[PDB]
């Protein structure tokens, strides 16, 4: 199923993004081309564990944010250069 839990982002910006990454999170965004983009934060290590299975980019997954569920597809992954961690991911609504 590869469901993810996410929370809506409290603050936007460079310092907020680095603070989320220092607190074991990472920013991401939900966009679909028909409705307004919604910016989420996620627990980094669960997305690591379900990304190591290569089925992240094949099938449509679910995000449990704020009590509502969006069925999306992984667009692109922004990773750290020299670390197995990542910094950002993008989602297309499908």
């Amino acid at each position: 199923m590869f469901t993810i839990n996410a929370e809506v982002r409290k603050e936007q910006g460079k310092g907020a993004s680095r603070r989320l990454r220092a607190a074991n999170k990472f920013p991401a965004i939900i966009y679909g081309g028909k409705e307004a983009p919604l910016a989420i934060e996620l627990d980094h290590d669960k997305v690591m564990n379900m990304q190591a299975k290569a089925e992240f980019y094949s099938e449509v997954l679910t995000i449990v944010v704020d009590g509502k569920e969006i069925k999306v597809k992984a667009q692109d992954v922004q990773r750290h250069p020299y670390k197995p961690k990542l910094q950002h991911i993008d989602f297309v609504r499908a």
Partner: protein, 136 residues
């Protein structure tokens, strides 16, 4: 050896190493030397590490060399004063930022890839990382 055959000018300024790496993902093969930390890779060490990799894989598989030494760095010789022109070029260097994939391999399994990569990282002055799984 591993230098440009023609260059627009015979010397260029030293400069500073930039912030981050560019082209960090595996692209051609399945495994690569993802660099950590700044430095200078010269032509002889990349030739030595490629020779070690080719020796370890025994002419099996394909090896792509991602970096190229396109920066000419000049050494003033021994017992010569300071000034009176820039020195002549002695060796050719490739500037490395953290995350830049240096080497590539495909067609060998994980064991022989990591073995040749161990020998190459032993030859090089720059560390490597470890993400090793199959490519999609």
């Amino acid at each position: 050896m591993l230098q440009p055959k023609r260059t627009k000018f015979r010397k260029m300024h030293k400069g500073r190493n930039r912030g981050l790496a560019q082209g960090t993902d595996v692209s051609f093969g399945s495994f690569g030397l993802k660099a950590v930390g700044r430095g200078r890779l010269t032509a002889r060490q990349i030739e030595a590490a490629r020779r070690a990799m080719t020796r370890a894989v025994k002419r099996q598989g394909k090896i792509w060399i991602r970096v190229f030494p396109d920066k000419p760095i000049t050494e003033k010789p021994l017992a010569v004063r300071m000034g009176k022109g820039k020195g002549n070029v002695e060796y050719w260097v490739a500037l490395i930022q953290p995350g830049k994939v240096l080497y590539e391999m495909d067609g060998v399994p994980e064991e022989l890839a990591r073995e040749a990569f161990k020998l190459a990282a032993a030859k090089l002055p720059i560390k490597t990382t470890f993400v090793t799984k199959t490519v999609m």
